[PDB]
Design a protein around this nucleic acid. Structure first.
Lengths: 197, 97, 214, 91, 127, 97, 25
RNA sequence: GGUGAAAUUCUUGGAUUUAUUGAAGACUAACUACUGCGAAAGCAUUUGCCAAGGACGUUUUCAUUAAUCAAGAACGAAAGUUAGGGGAUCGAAGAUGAUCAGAUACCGUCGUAGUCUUAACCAUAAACUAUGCCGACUAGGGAUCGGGUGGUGUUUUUUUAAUGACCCACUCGGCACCUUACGAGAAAUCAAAGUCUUUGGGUUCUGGGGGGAGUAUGGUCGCAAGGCUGAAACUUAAAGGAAUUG
């Protein structure tokens, strides 16, 4: 619940104590029940296999990436999302990725991530289409819906509130160096208005 | 009326060939409709080679000769002397010289 | 106000010993100041040279060579072969209408971790006693020729290192090996490798470098 | 009989929500409930269990696929490109 | 016995560049254009200011150690006209007679194996 | 180039079709050729490799799933494995393919 | 005028008429 | 930097220019042709795969299975539209600096949609070779593309050997081309626009002076843009074609 990305009860034999360790992975596009997942440096390159980013070659698609070696996954966990390895720097033990935000990041080689885009892709491509779906989407996440507009609120309840007309009054853009209570509206907006124009 | 046997183009049986820009006004025209000139001239002037031979440590020099294909629209070509409006009966004369 | 030409030492250039006269040219960078040594500044640079200069014969007027500095021995700088490209005059010269040209390309590494792309050029030939106005190819001999050319090229860099490649390439034996393997299909006029671009360089191995300079 | 012309599956949404919103949901809701061939048993029995989970009714398999298809196009190109990288490194 | 540099002339319209560099080409020596020679904004592409600009290089190209030069003629290139401007033939001639041993003269005009959309439009410029 | 000769088996030769019938036809030893699809479960094909090895009989891996094989054998249902009890004017047995 | 801009101006007129015609309808 | 000339723009923080890379997106220049394929619109990088084809050859095979084509159907440049990705160049709109008397146009700089892609729509162009499709016949020629045939012809390591390219005589099909008009046409011109007052091979569609007008309405299709069907009133004695002279 609260996550389109499906989990995989991946099971490993603990090499030190006789007991299997059932571990929650985020499923990739192409993993199925009974499939063997090979995790580690000497793993092959198939969809689902967990590999350190150093071994995997350039121009591949890797999801559920660790920011630092040992964080147990940080980046590209949302459904249908993935990180492209764009290059390596074998001298400094640091790879170079393209993050889903379009940002270019540097990651330690020892860090790792599953191969293949996260399953559940295309979730946002269908509208929730009614308030009931929206309610039942956020019921399983947190209390953040409905989101009343600050304009309709009274002046005491929101910086935008109040006035005989429903208008913000001051510029909605808020300085980054503002203080808690200021930061309502557009925070530290580098450039407002429509993208692509 | 129908001024030419092949309308203005070396295009028979295709329907489309390619757009090409002009080296003077940058006007998109079919490649075959263009005025093609293999401008074969040296980097330097004709009278210029003497000083190059004098001012080179290479006694036996190569005299390089650059190549560039000026693809011209007829609007620019006629204004640029590249072609001349010809007689109606002499229009059929397709010989380069 | 501070004249720039009065703060250099005029460093020189070495060519690999598999060439003609090693010395090429003298370039200015700066003094070896205490903060930034001139050695680091000199490194990573490329110099364009003419194979006629690096072989002494007008036979090699085209196919200029690209060299990259490796180690600065005082003012004298040894270089590794970095690439070669035809002079834009020569490429435009050999290309003429009414003769089809062949563009061949292979992406194959050397024996070491030193990968480069080999090109190849080929031009259809006006046959003897032949009276067709153009003599184009049949676009299936072109598929055949590009395969056999790529077979020749791929079985070449993979078979020998770069130093052995250049040493055997300076007599221009490769472009003959393309012709004699294509004389059974179609005759060719301008046959040359025409281009190399160097991509990756392995461990520098001053032992290998000093072998070609010393 | 022919019951609807163009609403199709989305006629359950009544006249509400507009026609464009019904059109976007139409072309995905069909993919959502469409039954798909299993890559393992070969029977057109794969149904969508949840968001991104595709349980083959027979042979009790389940495949992590797209939220509204057994396999997205943006992931089919993943599988294709993974092959070449595996292919080139090994051979 | 002699030193080689690179002349590296940028011969376009509306300005002309004569810019002698070392054989590696990274170090710049006496990058001079037409705009410094002529303030009339017209000779800047005319061969006159090309010859005056190109004579200024050799005025200081010597006494630094540049005996000979590898002239490298280049037009605007790219999507543009690709042909050298009026200065290309004349700013070349200021070099030749100014006392610079010219060798290995060649063109380095950037030919697009295939370019982007040319500037001007489909119907192009109209005057 | 395999699908053309399966019709020769389906009409001239004697076959048996499906897993249970095949392993029976391997146990009896009469079968000499078994064509295993690629969609079939790898465990089921793994022990059919074993039964084939026990009988010293040719095993051929079809280049497709049971849907291709079902069409190839000529039957509009699906077939995991097909066994060739005896082949008539078909040469699939005698050929290495 | 070209056949184009005669047609274009009637097309603009047709566009205006349909909005006005439907505006009452 | 830009111009016909300038100015707007960026620049002692270094623009422009020089080199090295790195990425992004687009396209496949030269080669490139009175050349090829495609039903048309279109198609110009390599390589691989998939399947489709036309021509050729055939002493194979089915043997009237054909041509055209209302109704109907697929494809259909560009522009445009919807959702997503992409977003280098150019660039509607827009903003600017010039020009003129005015210039919200041409010129220059920036720049949005767009140009690219995935999946759908629209179904239009001077979509033109302005020449419906099929069939036969009538004049000569030359080249070119693709196939095929023959030469004790040339040409390929071996000097009639392990065999492609070429030249010759051809032929089939194609894109076309040069002369001539027998013939046609109003002529321009056409080897098909010829075999039509010596009027009839088959067949489909379209036109009836110009405007109004591809408009109004009505229907249908379309997310819309709009497409298809499509008048009339009223109005004029002419528009129009091809050539001659000025």
């Amino acid at each position: 619940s609260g996550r389109g990305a499906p989990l995989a009860k991946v099971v490993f034999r603990d090499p030190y104590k006789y007991r299997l360790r059932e571990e929650i992975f985020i499923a990739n596009e192409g993993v199925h029940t009974g499939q063997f997942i090979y995790a580690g440096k000497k793993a092959s390159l198939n969809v689902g296999n967990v590999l350190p980013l150093g071994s995997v070659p350039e121009g591949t698609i890797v999801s559920n990436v660790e920011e630092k070696p040992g964080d147990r996954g940080a980046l590209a966990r949302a459904s249908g999302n993935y990180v492209i390895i764009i290059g390596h720097n074998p001298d400094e033990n640091k790879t170079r990725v393209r993050l889903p935000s379009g940002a270019k990041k540097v990651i330690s080689s020892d860090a790792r991530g599953v191969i293949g885009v996260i399953a559940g892709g295309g979730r946002v491509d269908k509208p929730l289409l009614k308030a009931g779906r929206a309610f039942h989407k956020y019921r399983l996440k947190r209390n953040s819906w409905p989101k009343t507009r600050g304009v309709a609120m009274n002046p005491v309840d929101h910086p935008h509130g109040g006035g005989n007309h429903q208008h913000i009054g001051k510029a909605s853009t808020i300085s980054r160096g503002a203080v808690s209570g200021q930061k309502a509206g557009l925070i530290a907006a580098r450039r407002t208005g429509l993208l692509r124009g | 009326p129908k001024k030419r046997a092949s309308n203005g183009r070396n295009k028979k049986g295709r329907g489309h060939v390619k757009p090409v820009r002009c080296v003077n006004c940058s006007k998109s025209i079919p490649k075959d409709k263009a005025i093609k000139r293999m401008a074969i001239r040296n980097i330097v002037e004709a009278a210029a080679v003497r000083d190059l031979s004098e001012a080179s440590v290479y006694p036996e020099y190569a005299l390089p000769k650059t190549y560039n294909k000026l693809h011209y629209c007829v609007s620019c070509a006629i204004h640029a002397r590249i072609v001349r409006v010809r007689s109606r009966e002499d229009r059929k004369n397709r010989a380069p010289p | 106000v501070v004249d720039p030409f009065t703060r250099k030492e005029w460093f020189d250039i070495k060519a690999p010993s598999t060439f003609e006269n090693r010395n090429v040219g003298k370039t200015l960078v700066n003094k070896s100041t205490g903060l930034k040594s001139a050695s680091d500044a000199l490194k990573g640079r490329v110099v364009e040279v003419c194979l006629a200069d690096l072989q002494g014969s007008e036979d090699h007027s085209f196919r200029k060579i690209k060299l990259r500095v490796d180690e600065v021995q005082g003012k004298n700088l040894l270089t590794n072969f970095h690439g070669m490209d035809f002079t834009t005059d020569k490429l435009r010269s050999m290309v003429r209408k009414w003769q089809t040209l062949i563009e061949a390309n292979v992406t194959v590494k050397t024996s070491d971790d030193y990968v480069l792309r080999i090109f190849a050029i080929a031009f259809t030939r006006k046959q003897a006693n032949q009276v067709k106005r153009h003599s184009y190819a049949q676009s299936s001999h072109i598929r055949a020729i590009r395969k056999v050319i790529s077979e020749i090229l791929t079985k070449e860099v993979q078979g020998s290192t770069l130093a052995q490649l250049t040493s055997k390439l300076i007599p221009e034996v490769i472009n003959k090996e393309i012709e004699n393997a294509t004389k059974d299909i179609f005759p060719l006029q301008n046959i040359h490798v025409r281009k190399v671009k160097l991509l990756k360089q392995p461990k520098f191995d001053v032992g290998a470098l000093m072998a070609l300079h010393g | 009989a022919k019951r609807t012309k163009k609403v199709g599956i989305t006629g359950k949404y009544g006249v509400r929500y507009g026609s464009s919103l019904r059109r976007q949901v139409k072309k995905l809701e069909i993919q959502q409930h469409a039954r798909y061939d299993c890559s393992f048993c070969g029977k057109k029995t794969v149904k969508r269990g949840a968001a991104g989970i595709w349980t083959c009714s027979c042979c009790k398999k389940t495949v992590a696929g797209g939220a509204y298809t057994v396999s997205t196009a943006a992931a089919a190109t993943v599988r294709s490109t993974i092959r070449r990288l595996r292919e080139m490194v090994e051979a | 016995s002699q030193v080689f540099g690179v002349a590296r002339i940028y011969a376009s319209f509306n300005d002309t560049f004569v810019h002698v560099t070392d054989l590696s080409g990274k170090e710049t020596i006496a990058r001079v254009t037409g705009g410094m020679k002529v303030k009339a904004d017209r000779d800047e592409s005319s061969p006159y200011a090309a010859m005056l600009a190109a004579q200024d290089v050799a005025a200081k190209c010597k006494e630094v150690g540049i005996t000979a030069v590898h002239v490298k003629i280049r037009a605007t290139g790219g999507t543009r006209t690709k042909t050298p401007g009026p200065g290309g033939q004349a700013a070349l001639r200021a070099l030749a007679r100014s006392g610079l041993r010219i060798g290995r003269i060649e063109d380095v005009t950037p030919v697009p194996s295939d370019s982007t959309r040319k500037k001007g439009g489909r119907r192009g410029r109209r005057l | 180039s395999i699908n053309q000769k399966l019709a020769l088996v389906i009409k001239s030769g004697k076959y048996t079709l499906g897993y249970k019938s095949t392993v029976k036809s391997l146990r009896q030893g009469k079968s000499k050729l078994i064509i295993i699809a690629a969609n079939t479960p790898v465990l089921r094909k793994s022990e059919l490799e074993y039964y084939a090895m026990l009988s010293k009989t040719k095993v051929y891996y079809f280049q497709g799933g049971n849907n291709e094989l079902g069409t190839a054998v000529g039957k509009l249902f699906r077939v995991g494995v097909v066994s060739i009890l005896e082949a008539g004017d078909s040469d699939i047995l005698t050929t290495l393919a | 005028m070209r056949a184009k801009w005669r047609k274009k101006r009637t097309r603009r007129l047709k566009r205006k008429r349909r909005k006005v015609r439907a505006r009452s309808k």
